[PDB]
């Protein structure tokens with residue numbers, strides 16, 4: 001028997017955890033005995049694009065980092081991704097809920113961890129393409145893990161990037177301009193997305209000040225298919241998201257430097273870590 005092999009029959013649902021682009025993540029108790037005593041596991045199954053889920057599973061299965069969600073196994077017939085369950089959930093609902101419990105140092109410790117898990121993925125020649133606060137799970141009050149790899153893709157040989165084919169559900173307000181204009185994803189673009197995730201982190205994931213809403217204040221919520229085009233210009237001009245309320249300038253300058261318009265010019269994760277550690281120590 002394989003410990004990473006999970007039966008569909010023994011996988012009884014409990015509650016829906018999170019919604020993804022193509023996949024659906026629900027909490028299941030895997031109980032082979034059948035008496036509410038099996039371990040609780042997070043289960044990703046496509047809504048009724050198997051190749052992509054299959055590809056995500058081989059990427060996650062070979063990721064071993066303390067700030068990357070642990071792969072628990074699979075479920076075949078047709079496939080389901082079996083991950084570990086983190087009861088505190090994602091930063092999206094934990095941050096507003098525990099504002100009092102989490103302060104600035106804890107917020108920057110989270111950023112270092114996200115940066116770290118990010119570097120591991122990058123050094124293993126993989127590009128995330130979906131780095132936002134809803135994709136970061138809380139291990140404990142001291143530890144956070146990257147919990148979704150739905151749009152993670154391999155970077156082509158001798159190429160500095162992955163050329164994006166389909167992009168119908170690309171999170172545009174989190175995206176770098178090279179992705180908005182050229183539609184080619186670079187590791188440097190995952191750094192742009194980090195800076196935005198960083199803003200959400202500092203605002204405790206607040207709806208009324210989410211990166212979409214704040215960018216709309218600068219372009220307008222009545223332009224539908226022009227939304228993206230205007231956004232590209234606002235960035236060409238030099239404008240960026242505002243400073244979060246009660247965020248220091250030295251932090252905001254690390255956030256601003258996450259938005260250096262060129263990919264060849266833009267910072268790496270290793271630089272951001274050292275930059276963050278310089279504020280914690």
Ligand SMILES: N#C[C@@H]1CCC[C@@H]1Nc1nc(-c2cn[nH]c2)nc2c1CC=NC2=O
Pocket residue numbers: 017018019020025042069083084085086087088089090093134135136137146147148
């Ligand atoms: N991270 C992440 C992504 C977001 C899209 C699907 C996946 N979601 C998930 N969402 C949640 C969750 C808990 N509260 N709110 C969400 N928990 C988990 C996962 C994925 C894996 N393990 C979890 O414990």
